[PDB]
Amino acid sequence: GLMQFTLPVRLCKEIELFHFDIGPFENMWPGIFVYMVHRSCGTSCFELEKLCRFIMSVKKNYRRVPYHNWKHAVTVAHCMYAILQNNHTLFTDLERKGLLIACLCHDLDHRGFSNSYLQKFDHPLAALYSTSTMEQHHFSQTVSILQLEGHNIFSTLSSSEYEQVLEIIRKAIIATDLALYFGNRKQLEEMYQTGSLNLNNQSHRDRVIGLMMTACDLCSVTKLWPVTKLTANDIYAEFWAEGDEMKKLGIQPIPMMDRDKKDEVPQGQLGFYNAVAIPCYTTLTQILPPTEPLLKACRDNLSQWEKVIRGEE
Numbered sequence: 001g002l003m004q005f006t007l008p009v010r011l012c013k014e015i016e017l018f019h020f021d022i023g024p025f026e027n028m029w030p031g032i033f034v035y036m037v038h039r040s041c042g043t044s045c046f047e048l049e050k051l052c053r054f055i056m057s058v059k060k061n062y063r064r065v066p067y068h069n070w071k072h073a074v075t076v077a078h079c080m081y082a083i084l085q086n087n088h089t090l091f092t093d094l095e096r097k098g099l100l101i102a103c104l105c106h107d108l109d110h111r112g113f114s115n116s117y118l119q120k121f122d123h124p125l126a127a128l129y130s131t132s133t134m135e136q137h138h139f140s141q142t143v144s145i146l147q148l149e150g151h152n153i154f155s156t157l158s159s160s161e162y163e164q165v166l167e168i169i170r171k172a173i174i175a176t177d178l179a180l181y182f183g184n185r186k187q188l189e190e191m192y193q194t195g196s197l198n199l200n201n202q203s204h205r206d207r208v209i210g211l212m213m214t215a216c217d218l219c220s221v222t223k224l225w226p227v228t229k230l231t232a233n234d235i236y237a238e239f240w241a242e243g244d245e246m247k248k249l250g251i252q253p254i255p256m257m258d259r260d261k262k263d264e265v266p267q268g269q270l271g272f273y274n275a276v277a278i279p280c281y282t283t284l285t286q287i288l289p290p291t292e293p294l295l296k297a298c299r300d301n302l303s304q305w306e307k308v309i310r311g312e313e
């Protein structure tokens with residue numbers, strides 16, 4: 001109860017910032033996550049013995065892949081931490097609880113392959129879940145760990161609140177299917193621009209949480225250039241491996257997943273910042289102004305990718 005977590009001064013300061021990198025010391029990441037839950041939610045939110053055990057079962061069920069790994073799970077929870085800390089009054093006690101756990105669980109048991117590849121490969125998960133194939137798997141894994149013994153971190157909630165929080169987490173994890181981002185933002189854009197957006201509307205709240213999850217999921221594009229640059233290597237490591245597996249199915253992959261088409265990556269990143277990233281943080285800033293630093297950082301990396309094409313690096 002009186003056992004606070006405390007980080008070194010540089011991390012204690014820098015972890016409040018949006019562009020925070022959790023660093024290469026894996027054994028610190030669980031403590032970083034418990035510090036964030038304590039500040040963002042409260043020392044009373046979770047039983048420390050259960051949370052710690054929950055955290056370590058989740059870690060175990062992430063795989064050793066270049067990008068969609070344990071570090072990504074924690075990085076995505078940090079972004080969600082920063083948003084909730086800068087938007088202090090807007091979110092309920094169950095949301096702040098649900099959302100940090102949703103972020104940590106969002107990519108449980110990821111194999112480094114897109115939904116497309118599972119469909120074309122005719123993976124068993126594709127027959128079980130026809131859309132948002134991995135995301136439904138991710139949520140299924142989350143429920144599996146919650147139900148392990150001594151892992152029910154929500155055991156103080158009423159039966160009804162417990163159902164609410166698992167509904168928050170399900171929708172939250174499904175929203176990280178990028179296929180669903182495009183329509184979600186467009187609907188939020190119109191609701192803002194016609195001025196009919198309404199945070200008391202539960203249908204509206206879900207969409208906003210959906211956008212927050214995309215924002216957090218893509219947050220490697222909102223770091224200082226060196227972190228974003230080096231994370232781009234890990235993502236394409238996964239992309240190029242999948243392309244190889246596409247070729248093995250007798251399918252020429254899209255250039256994004258073809259390693260013989262590295263030259264085209266800089267231009268591919270512009271399209272992505274223009275088509276996906278900037279629109280995502282713009283709309284998010286419009287609905288939550290104190291998230292503006294995610295937009296600024298995103299623009300800074302977009303500018304850096306233009307410099308790459310101009311041969312200045």
Ligand SMILES: O=C(N[C@@H]1CCN(c2ccc(Cl)cn2)C1)c1nc(C2CC2)ccc1Nc1cncnc1
Pocket residue numbers: 178218220221228229231232235255256257261264265267268269271272
């Ligand atoms: O870039 C991403 N998608 C782009 C789509 C088009 N792109 C493309 C097109 C043509 C060529 Cl020839 C090369 N590439 C790539 C990306 N996607 C995801 C989720 C799987 C959806 C997450 C992060 C991402 N970027 C990222 C950048 N930096 C640090 N971390 C992640």
Ligand SMILES: [Mg+2]
Pocket residue numbers: 106107134176177
């Ligand atoms: Mg995912």
Ligand SMILES: [Zn+2]
Pocket residue numbers: 072076106107176217
């Ligand atoms: Zn993810």
